[PDB]
Amino acid sequence: SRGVNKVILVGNLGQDPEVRYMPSGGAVANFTLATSESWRDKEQTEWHRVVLFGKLAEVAGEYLRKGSQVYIEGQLRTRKWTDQQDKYTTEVVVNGGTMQMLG
Amino acid sequence: SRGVNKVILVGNLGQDPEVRYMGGAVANFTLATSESWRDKGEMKEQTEWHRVVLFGKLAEVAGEYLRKGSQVYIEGQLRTRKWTDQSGQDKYTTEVVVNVGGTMQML
Amino acid sequence: SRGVNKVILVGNLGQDPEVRYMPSGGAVANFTLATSESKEQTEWHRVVLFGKLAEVAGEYLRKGSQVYIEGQLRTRKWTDQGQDKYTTEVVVNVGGTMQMLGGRQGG
Amino acid sequence: SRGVNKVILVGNLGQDPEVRYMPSGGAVANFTLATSESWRDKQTGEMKEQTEWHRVVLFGKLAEVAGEYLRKGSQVYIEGQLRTRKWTDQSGQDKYTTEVVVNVGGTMQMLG
């Protein structure tokens, strides 16, 4: 493998985790994570799209709710999709990655 | 300051850095990282392209010394910004932004 | 600079932060932070904070507090009553932070 | 599994890696890694340099890869965790060593 692609997030879920099961039986979870920065000339929030697979996805479905504080270690992935044109979404994907609930 | 938003990358510039002066400098370039896995059986490979943006001294350093193919270490944060393109379509871009608490190191 | 020296910790304070003032007047906080892998084994990390963050730690942190630490490794040499001793600490530098995560361990 | 214990290093080997094989059969490698930072004292204006030497330990394939390809002065990327281990020395002194340990879930990457 060439280079390093690593994301570390701590923040709060903006909604309940959505868990879907793949025909194979592999769990997949999605949720958004808020991080913010406040400074004096001000507050700016960043919303991260997190994707979890397998057991970690199942853990998210059991235990995570809107407002839950989690730690995320994942990788950046930009994927192309089209809808009713070309759209691109950059996600934080947990594959070597971990998820830990902090409350 | 509320939560943690941290990106760490090691990779190679996909082109020469674009440097513009505002007085603070702003530089941008793309970074390739790749993972290689073996098929279930051939050595396969996928590259990920990251959009990096630098501000101040780091941007100026990038313009001086970085070129297409340079290997760098980046520590920054994620920012998704919205723009409408000239067709009226709302578009979003996620970039890796290196401000003060971030670094860039040439390897 | 030359190379990268980065430690990232999430865990719980082993004791109350010890805050002392240096001759210079700068604040310094010291405490231990526990991390564990599960068979279960605990790693105790020696954390050192300086200035405003150290005072913040003394005000608001207690034994059992969950914190996030971003710092760097420093091994410092000190002699005992006369053998040479070394301690490796996680020191929160310019580019580092400490963030209170809320919640606390019990007994 | 409880909390987070992560070290990230980029630096240069201070020696060739020593690779011993355990009786179990798994390889173990160790070497020291130098990281340095340079800054100008904001109060005094002086230029300052400080080097930090890290003790790295690798297991399994990475240990073997290190023995094959890494040498003194090689630039590597390390991701691992901190471990402090206790030992009494032949003089009877309790001693402590903090190492950067790369197990499963860590990586070692040759740079350049």
Residue numbers in the entry:
A (entry chain D): 3 to 43, 50 to 92, 95 to 105, 107 to 114
B (entry chain C): 3 to 24, 27 to 44, 47 to 113
C (entry chain B): 3 to 40, 50 to 92, 94 to 119
D (entry chain A): 3 to 114
Lines from the paper:
SSB binds to ssDNA with high affinity, regardless of sequence, and prevents premature annealing, chemical attacks, and unwanted nuclease digestion. SSBs typically recognize ssDNA via a highly conserved oligonucleotide/oligosaccharide-binding (OB) fold formed from a five-stranded β-barrel capped by an α-helix. SSB consists of an N-terminal ssDNA-binding/oligomerization domain (SSBn) and a flexible C-terminal protein–protein interaction domain (SSBc).
We crystallized KpSSB through hanging drop vapor diffusion and determined its structure at a resolution of 2.35 Å. The KpSSB monomer has an OB-fold domain similar to EcSSB, and the core of the OB-fold domain possesses a β-barrel capped with an α-helix. Unlike Streptomyces coelicolor SsbB, Staphylococcus aureus SsbA (SaSsbA) and SaSsbB, KpSSB contained additional β6 strand. β6 strands function by clamping two neighboring subunits together in a tetrameric SSB. As compared with the crystal structures of the EcSSB- and Pseudomonas aeruginosa SSB (PaSSB)–ssDNA complex, we found that a GGRQ motif occurs at residues 114, which might be a regulatory switch for SSBn or ssDNA binding. In the structure of KpSSB, the GGRQ motif interacted with Asn14, Lys74, and Gln77 via several hydrogen bonds. These GGRQ motif-interacting residues (Asn14, Lys74, and Gln77) in KpSSB, perfectly conserved in EcSSB and PaSSB, are ssDNA-binding residues in EcSSB- and PaSSB–ssDNA complexes.
